[PDB]
């Protein structure tokens, strides 16, 4: 009973506590601008703007996750015919990218029929089969099987490449008809039964149907030729005949063998490699793998990508600390200080306790570093949110944020020491094995 | 040398208040905030406005000075035919008001062509001899020779009686030449020389074409008849015909002889008249003339009227203090204090050093007085500003507010207990008698 | 609303702080601890937490206390400062657990510590109501007719007198096929007022 009491909330206890908070200055100040204002747009503080707000960088190269893979891929191509402008399909990668976690998802379901209703993967499984976020191995996997195309021979066309989420939501009412389908059938049969196998060609079709609905399958097939005119930056006209797959490594130049993600989660050792297990799009396809590192190590291969002059491919917890209006990335930018809110918890602890996720990824295009001999000061990143985001789609992030709200960047194995690059090659390394629902997973 | 010196801003005093105040937590907060928003939006304050933005009131009744002054005669009609809807035209009583301030500009220059044209009481004169302001013996002054008529025989449909700013300006600077020609004209003359006499009809000519190109001289003249068909708040018709003046008391029921204004006007001794000299609009017109009263003095007097069931006339310092979006009138509505901004220059000393003056004039419908034994805690207030201003119009006015930022209010002269009565019936009162300029002048 | 709004939220971190405690044998990662802080001030309710409010705090006339501050009607930014902070607490606690004793004299202390912390940083963004539960108002108001008329009365005798609430009449019914009809259904721990009602209903 003491006990209890105490724990409640006492109604003289507040009261007293709020006669005392009115005697200071500060907090009356304080309450009667927040009762006026939203917290981030009073407590935004100028001061502070005015020095991080800085656009120089001396180390610069010359649905957001699949602009952010395909970024240097498509400069690959404009700098390989000679281009003035150049896009890549990113609706082409988005079909086939939902087409195949619908199919995974069934898959998911089969192989933990074993497991009740209410259990948490299955309950996680149901939560959200078919959404739009990735991570680089999904985007892999994804260009290993259908290769690349033009934009312009596959555009943003449709409805629902940019407003996704009533497509999204009829598709899932279906796969979780379909989830239950399936495990009915499975009590009674074995899932290599015929009967199983052909329900499941059945739920693809389904699914295949109804995506065609909202969306046309791509107009030729990986193998399959497709020719397209476009216009250099000279007005000169050309012809190119190739396949996604031949257009993928010989214009675009991708080697699926390079890209390797590195990662700072200080809630295990670094040196070690991470797992997050299940997480996937097209069955049977590569594991989202990172290998964590310690943030000096995430920082000075930043630099040293930019000064091969190739952009870096980040996931971080957008919007945290972002400010959209000026394009500034900076945990001090707010003074929250000054109504003493205070935020001791660490990063392990911020991912631990539900505070902090990767939610977004972007590209690091420059960095400016202490023209003496230090480190990194500040980074220059852009997103896929129109020049009217940010600085025309312009970011400037500090040092401190990239150690604090960044996790993942995305690196060739030969920028790596060999001492890293080792443990993606040497077959020795068992991996840190994370929950499917894992906060170090699919970015935006 | 000593005192320049000490009297400079000095970089390094300015830099070390600096240091000081950023070391308080309170300045820390307040500049945060302040640059960001505007002081009276980031301090208004909530706690307070729930507690004054009270809406009940137990004493009430059941170009704005024109809207102020003609809302009781308008309402005396309505009263008087049993009509549903009406209003009396206000585009009349501004089209004469115009007309006779050109007149009465030409006469000014004339009396004052002994002073240099940089003397101030001539330069005042030339700043702005045609503005739309006015006080309640200005009005009196245009219905004694105008009357009034139905809204439904002259209207606001011209361009420049609701966006008066460009013909005011066509005016003023023909005034302005025509104050040369006539100073001119006086160097060699006198006044009564026929010449001075026919001049200044030549400007009347002229002022009156001018004005005659953007509002229609009134459809009948005062004296003259007009027939006015209307429907009563029955669906019934009828039909008036009557004239401007005959119109104003037997329908409106003014009568000239009963307006008095008080004012509290702590620069000077209560008890005493208050003469604006030179303020007017028709020539040889009434004086702007108040009775000098302590405020206790003039919010019993208000109270009373409304006791009588009829609305206050009153003039204030808009907009001080006032907060438009939620209609309230509370000199602590904002948190100044907060930020360490705190006002003692009192009511006097405001007026005398530029701070403080009477700028508009509405209307108090109602009051609050203390329910046991008391007087008046707040005013409901209206004005002609739409419904979209303060609460479709509504505004309440605390009697601090009324003590601190109103000077006049006018009433009835039999409302007026007979010591103050006969200040203006005795002749006896010789009153204090204050330049064209001073502060508590025209009304807008 | 704001007056029950202010004081569910209130009471929902509160209680929150007790769900940590008393799952603090469990693992960071356990199905309900992630659960417990995964959105800890959520705005919505139940109607035995209504029930909960009520019966604590009584009811007020919007005119004594409106919906005048901006988080009244766009709370995510306050929510998401406050769940920030009752994460950190979370582990606060939790931390502070595993060398003691809950009913230990540095926890009960840890804990009105959070919570004062909590008041406060709610006090910046709404007013605590006007006056407390069993303290009078006094209330002026106009009737349908013009006239006008003063109620001097508490939060709480406002609820039953004037509002007429009796408590004990309320029940939900509920259509759940999930379940047997006939059946009473009771969700574990959702709630708001520590030791309040639980969410039950009849299917």
Redesign the interface.
């Known amino acids: 009973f003491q006990?209890?009491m105490?724990?409640?909330?006492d109604?003289s206890?507040?009261?007293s506590?709020?006669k005392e908070?009115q005697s200071d200055?500060?907090?009356?100040?304080?309450?009667?601008?927040?009762?006026?204002?939203?917290?981030?747009?009073?407590?935004?503080?100028?001061?502070r703007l005015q020095k991080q707000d800085n656009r120089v960088f001396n180390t610069v190269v010359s649905r957001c996750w699949l602009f952010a893979a395909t970024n240097q891929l498509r400069l690959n191509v404009l700098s390989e015919l000679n281009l003035k402008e150049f896009e890549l399909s990113q609706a082409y990668l988005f079909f086939y990218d939902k087409l195949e976690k619908a199919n995974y998802f069934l898959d998911q379901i089969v192989s933990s029929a074993d497991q009740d209703i209410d259990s948490?993967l299955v309950q996680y499984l149901l939560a959200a089969p078919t959404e739009d976020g990735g991570q680089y191995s999904m985007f892999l996997n994804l260009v290993k099987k259908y290769g690349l195309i033009p934009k312009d021979l596959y555009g943003d066309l449709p409805y629902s490449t940019t407003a996704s989420r009533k497509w999204n939501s009829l598709l899932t009412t279906k796969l979780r008809e379909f989830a239950e389908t399936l495990r009915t059938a499975l009590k009674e049969r074995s899932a290599d039964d015929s009967i199983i196998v052909t329900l499941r060609e059945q739920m693809q079709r389904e699914i295949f149907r109804l995506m065609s609905l909202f969306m046309d399958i791509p107009p030729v097939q990986p193998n399959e030729q497709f020719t397209w005119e476009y216009v250099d930056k000279d007005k000169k006209i050309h012809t190119i005949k190739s396949t996604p797959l031949e257009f993928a490594s010989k214009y675009a130049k991708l080697d699926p063998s390079t890209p390797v993600s590195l990662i700072n989660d200080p809630r295990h050792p670094y040196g070690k490699l991470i797992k997050i297990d299940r997480l996937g799009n097209v069955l049977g396809g590569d594991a989202v793998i990172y290998l964590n590192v310690d943030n000096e190590t995430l920082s000075k291969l930043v630099v040293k990508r930019l000064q091969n002059n190739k952009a870096v491919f980040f996931g971080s917890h957008t919007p945290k600390f972002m400010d959209k209006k000026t394009g500034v990335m900076d945990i001090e930018l707010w003074?929250y200080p000054?109504?003493?809110?205070n935020?001791?918890?660490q990063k392990a602890?911020?991912i631990?306790?539900?505070?902090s996720l990767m939610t977004h990824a972007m590209l690091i295009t420059g960095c400016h570093v202490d023209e003496t001999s230090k480190l990194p000061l500040r980074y220059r990143v852009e997103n896929s949110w129109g020049k009217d985001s940010g600085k025309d789609g312009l970011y400037v992030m500090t040092q401190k944020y990239f150690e604090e709200y960044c996790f993942q960047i995305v690196v060739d194995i030969n920028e790596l020491p060999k001492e890293l690059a080792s443990k993606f090659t040497s077959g020795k390394e068992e991996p840190i094995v994370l929950?499917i629902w894992d906060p170090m997973g699919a970015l935006a």
């Open positions: 006990g209890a105490s724990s409640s909330i109604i206890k507040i009261n506590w709020n908070f200055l500060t907090h009356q100040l304080a309450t009667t601008v927040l009762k006026n204002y939203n917290a981030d747009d009073a407590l935004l503080n100028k001061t948490r003074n000054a109504i003493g809110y935020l001791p918890q602890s911020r631990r306790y539900h505070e929950p």
